[PDB]
Design a binder for these strands. Structure first.
Lengths: 51, 63, 66, 64
DNA sequence: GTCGCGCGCGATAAACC
DNA sequence: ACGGTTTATCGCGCGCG
């Protein structure tokens, strides 16, 4: 159900949603493989939505 | 996405609730099994296919 | 397969309650995780251990479901 | 850290513009692949190595 | 502080045809 | 004088502190 809820960093999403950062990056890279999201370069990386 | 369509069309053509293996796909489509499993497990990560754990695994159209 | 006996003897120790991961076994036994896992997967197939799917997967002593 | 010196030594003795995999380096040099990759990725960060995209990744001397 | 990692994978045993 | 080839969860990309 975590995927249904979800630029910003997974660092920010972890504190905003109260979820371990490991689980946030897991759903981001999954939906990024699903194409719905796109990752921008940064440290930590930036995450935006693809239209 | 071209290889993804040959796999999805066959599974869709091959019955409405039937599954098949990567080996069967390898033969029917004339493609090394490595390329088939590369696409199959990718479609499973995308949610396009449902994987039945087995030896070999069985692949069916996903929700 | 000399390590697989040390894997079980470490697993059978403190084995009434919880389980452990392969990364923990890699450090506990001073063995590269490449050998720990391929011993574990061979151990789970032999019926001496049971694999609990996870991230990372957890490994314990096999529990009879007879 | 003489592991970096022998990796570049192997890729140098391989040929001009020749590339190989991390799994091939692990066996020819007798070193765990876990150690090989952490150096190959580091040598690319220093700019001394270039990584061809693929599966597995192909490693060659940088033509930067 | 990037990190998502689940990985065992063959220096293969076994199975196949 | 002689079983070659493919499977196995085999999909692996992994380097991770």
């Amino acid at each position: 159900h975590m995927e249904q809820r979800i630029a910003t960093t997974a660092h920010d999403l972890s504190g905003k949603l109260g979820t371990p950062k490991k689980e946030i990056n897991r759903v981001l890279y999954s939906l990024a493989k699903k194409g719905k999201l796109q990752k921008e370069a940064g440290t930590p990386p930036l995450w935006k939505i693809a239209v």
